[PDB]
Design a protein around this nucleic acid. Structure first.
Ligand SMILES: [Mg+2]
Ligand SMILES: [Mg+2]
Ligand SMILES: [Mg+2]
Ligand SMILES: [Mg+2]
Ligand SMILES: [Mg+2]
Ligand SMILES: [Mg+2]
Ligand SMILES: [Mg+2]
Ligand SMILES: [Mg+2]
Ligand SMILES: [Mg+2]
Ligand SMILES: [Mg+2]
Ligand SMILES: [Mg+2]
Ligand SMILES: [Mg+2]
Ligand SMILES: [Mg+2]
Ligand SMILES: [Mg+2]
Ligand SMILES: [Mg+2]
Ligand SMILES: [Mg+2]
Ligand SMILES: [Mg+2]
Ligand SMILES: [Mg+2]
Ligand SMILES: [Mg+2]
Ligand SMILES: [Mg+2]
Lengths: 77, 136, 94, 116, 58
RNA sequence: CCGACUUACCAACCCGAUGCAAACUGCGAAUACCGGAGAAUGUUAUCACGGGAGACACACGGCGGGUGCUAACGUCCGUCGUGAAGAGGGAAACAACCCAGACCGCCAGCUAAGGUCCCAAAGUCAUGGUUAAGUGGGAAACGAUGUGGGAAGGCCCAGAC
RNA sequence: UCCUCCUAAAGAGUAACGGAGGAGCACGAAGGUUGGCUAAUCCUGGUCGGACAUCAGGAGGUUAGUGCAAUGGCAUAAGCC
RNA sequence: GCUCAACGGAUAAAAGGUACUCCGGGGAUAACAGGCUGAUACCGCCCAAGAGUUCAUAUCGACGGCGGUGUUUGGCACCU
RNA sequence: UGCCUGGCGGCCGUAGCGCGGUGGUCCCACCUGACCCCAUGCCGAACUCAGAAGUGAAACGCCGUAGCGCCGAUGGUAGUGUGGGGUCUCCCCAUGCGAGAGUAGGGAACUGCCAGGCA
């Protein structure tokens, strides 16, 4: 009772371009909080761990790695 | 009266009670009191139904209680309007689904347990039945 | 010693098994590793009574499917949550 | 493990050259021999490899596994690589400190036309 | 190849917005309306989606 | 003094078994959403720019919930439907529930929900069972040789109740 | 007014005087880069020294750590020199 | 250069009494009564530890459970 | 062409842990010495240099082993989209999707490009 009723604005995170979509260079793919999806081929990683395209093509999600970590990669097709 | 000590969160959502129970077998003991209905069964109806059957078997035999409340149920006071915060916790209930084996006991002849479990089933809101250990 | 008659199941699923269990029959399967599993249907009242014997879970039973006899052992069982009934019996090809 | 620490010492440097897509010249060093091979950006197939275990290199060398022997194989890998048209490589380290035999392995190869 | 006849037997008053578009895809307009469509794994997927309003004399 | 004998005791960590969790997850659907291709259907149903508005008091019902007492024709959200702004038939009467969306006329026919003994249109219809209570045509724990069906069990013509 | 989790119904968003906690800063290194390193907690042995200081081996493995609340993350360390 | 923190910030600059009161509106919103609900209250029942010298049910009845009426204190704000 | 050893990957526990055995011609590891290039918030222990006396003990690779880790059916169960129904704070019917846990079982990897030794 009382001493509550506070919350913050939703940050609108999540995947913006799902698999198989054609992106242009520099377009945000996922907005993250940690690094849930790591940077694969032809994608970057901003200071918020935002994954952005680096050369236009089709997005592709992968599970490469000894630790089974999700990698987002782009094929220039 | 059964009640958790040092629980993570003081007040809990109401939630719903759908499905069939998990502990449907007599494992620790030999004869059990299996629930047939549905509905929350509080912490005083457990002790009131326990004394009734640790006394109908004198004091001999083992008795197992296979439920625990761990669910705080609040209650708004009297003459208080609605809103202005969730009410304070008053008692603890254990959600029961049809199939839960509530009590079981061992070390007694069957006809003594079948009567002791009858004097405990009269203190419980939900319907109950007498079930016996099976080979599986 | 118990010999139980059974028949193969024409259709399988959820609505095709609750349809059986409303006709006093319940499904069961026989699997033995090196052979294809055999899903069968069999009566309820004739096997719920016979399971009351403690020996049902210790000896090598016999199932008569399409004339031939299969020697099996009761591996597992599923019971109704609050009724003296059955839902499934797992038979291993002993 | 004295080798698992080294293999995880060079992982960050190794995995950047996979991301850059640049041909790398990995180096392996032992208390007796020293190897050096050129590995394509693919990372699964090699192009040029020179080492101190070959009879055509160790036969005119006093002792394999010292600075002047490293300069003998650093010269070799640079001639083979330039012969097939590879000129722009990057130097891997494999966890060895760039101070001793590896430095002379890199310095000699650098002096023979290789660019890194 | 072989055409298929679909007739609507129920109203589309309170149906979900997805079942109102499926009728538009099939081309049915009112109760008792009959249309002759081409048989196809995509057309037969329309019928299954609204297989409580339409009745097919295949 | 060391502990030297002891204790009808409490008891952490682990081991086997049994449960619970919106703020637990070594698992994990159905749907929903995003993108690509392809038929068919729809008077472009889509988007962009411009002229004119109204509206920002919503209600009930189904499903997922928070609050409440899993109380309210209570209150706050998500999605669908209806009323608002929709007449007609049904639920006796009954904005919201079920069927169904009225351009006009006809002393023409077929149906939906719901019904066919009279009020009041249509089966005092056909075959087989159940109920003796006016149950049908309000309500629980619990109690009982009411009655139909089913699988077994015990004793019994060396004679059972 | 701002931040974090749940309610929020597995894309985004989503209310109540619903359930729980925080902020109005810090840092000239606590930033850049290069080189190097791996924790908690238990066992044994040991001088003061004890259940817990420091030392040596073993298990364990990130159950530690992150300037500050919570969530996501982190070994190629985003943790420690 | 602003706890313009009432934090999209009415002024650089601001508290109260009115039962002596007044105007425009609202059953969009309270007091009375009605309405829906029945937490609470009143009435009844179920199991029976026990009291009753013996003896649970002559009379009461613990720890618990299930309902009825719409008589109380309330909840909601549908009518005025 | 086969066997063994070294480097770099694909692949990620059916691939890892434990237990037993086995390998030194070459490769590898331990190893000798340290004034020197270089380093210890002390210590050549680690890093580094100069080499070969010795060993395969430790480590590593290889072979066997299920004692763990791990993978995992078929059948049934739960849940759920759409449409109906009930004595509708919970369920049933038609139809489509269909887990989790568990059972039978599988299992101590597979593979590519180079460079050495041996046959
Ligand atoms: Mg407004
Ligand atoms: Mg509003
Ligand atoms: Mg609203
Ligand atoms: Mg309302
Ligand atoms: Mg109407
Ligand atoms: Mg009427
Ligand atoms: Mg019209
Ligand atoms: Mg008539
Ligand atoms: Mg009546
Ligand atoms: Mg969301
Ligand atoms: Mg959603
Ligand atoms: Mg920092
Ligand atoms: Mg670094
Ligand atoms: Mg840093
Ligand atoms: Mg404001
Ligand atoms: Mg203002
Ligand atoms: Mg006066
Ligand atoms: Mg006035
Ligand atoms: Mg009003
Ligand atoms: Mg209102």
């Amino acid at each position: 009772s009382t001493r509550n009723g506070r919350d913050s604005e939703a940050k609108r995170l999540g995947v913006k371009r799902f698999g198989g979509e054609s992106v242009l260079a520099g377009s945000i793919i996922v907005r993250q909080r940690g690094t849930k999806f790591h940077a694969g081929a032809n994608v970057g990683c901003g200071r918020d761990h935002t994954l952005f395209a680096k050369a236009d093509g089709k997005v592709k999600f992968e599970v490469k790695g000894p630790k089974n970590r999700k990698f987002i990669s782009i094929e220039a097709e | 009266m059964l009640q958790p000590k040092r629980t993570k969160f003081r007040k809990m959502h109401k939630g719903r009670n759908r499905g069939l129970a998990q502990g449907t077998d007599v494992s620790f003991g030999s004869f059990g009191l299996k629930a047939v209905g549905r509905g929350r069964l509080t912490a005083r109806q457990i002790e009131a139904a326990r004394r009734a059957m640790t006394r109908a078997v004198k004091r001999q035999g083992k008795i197992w209680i296979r439920v625990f409340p761990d669910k705080p149920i609040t209650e708004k006071p009297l003459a208080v309007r609605m809103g202005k915060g969730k009410g304070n916790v008053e008692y603890w209930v254990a959600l029961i689904q049809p199939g839960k084996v509530l009590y079981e006991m061992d070390g007694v002849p069957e006809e003594l347990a079948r009567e002791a479990f009858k004097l405990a089933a009269a203190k419980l809101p939900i319907k109950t039945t007498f079930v016996t250990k099976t080979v599986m | 010693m118990f010999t139980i008659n059974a028949e193969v199941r024409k259709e399988q699923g959820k609505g095709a098994s609750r349809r059986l269990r409303a006709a006093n029959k319940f499904p069961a399967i026989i699997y033995g590793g090196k052979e294809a599993p055999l899903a069968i249907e069999l009566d309820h009242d004739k096997v719920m009574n016979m399971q009351a014997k403690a020996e049902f879970y210790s000896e090598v039973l016999t199932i008569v499917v399409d004339g031939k006899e299969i020697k099996v052992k009761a591996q597992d069982v599923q019971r109704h949550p609050y009724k003296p009934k059955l839902q499934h019996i797992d038979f291993v090809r002993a | 493990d004295k080798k698992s620490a080294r293999i995880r010492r060079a992982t960050r440097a190794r995995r950047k050259l996979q991301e850059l897509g640049a041909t790398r010249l990995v180096v392996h060093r032992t208390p007796r021999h020293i190897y050096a091979q050129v590995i394509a950006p693919n990372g699964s197939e090699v192009l040029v490899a020179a080492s101190t275990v070959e009879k055509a290199i160790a036969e005119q060398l006093k002792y394999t596994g010292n600075k002047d022997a490293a300069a003998a194989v650093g010269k070799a890998v640079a001639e083979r690589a330039l012969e097939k048209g590879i000129k722009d490589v990057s130097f891997d380290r494999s966890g060895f400190q760039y101070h001793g035999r590896v430095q002379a392995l890199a310095d000699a190869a650098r002096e023979a036309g290789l660019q890194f | 190849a072989k055409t298929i006849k679909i007739t609507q037997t129920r109203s589309a008053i309170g149906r979900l917005p997805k079942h109102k578009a499926t009728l538009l895809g099939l081309g049915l307009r009112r109760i008792g309306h009959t249309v002759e469509r081409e048989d196809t794994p995509a057309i037969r997927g329309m019928i299954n989606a609204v297989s409580f309003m339409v009745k097919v004399e295949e």
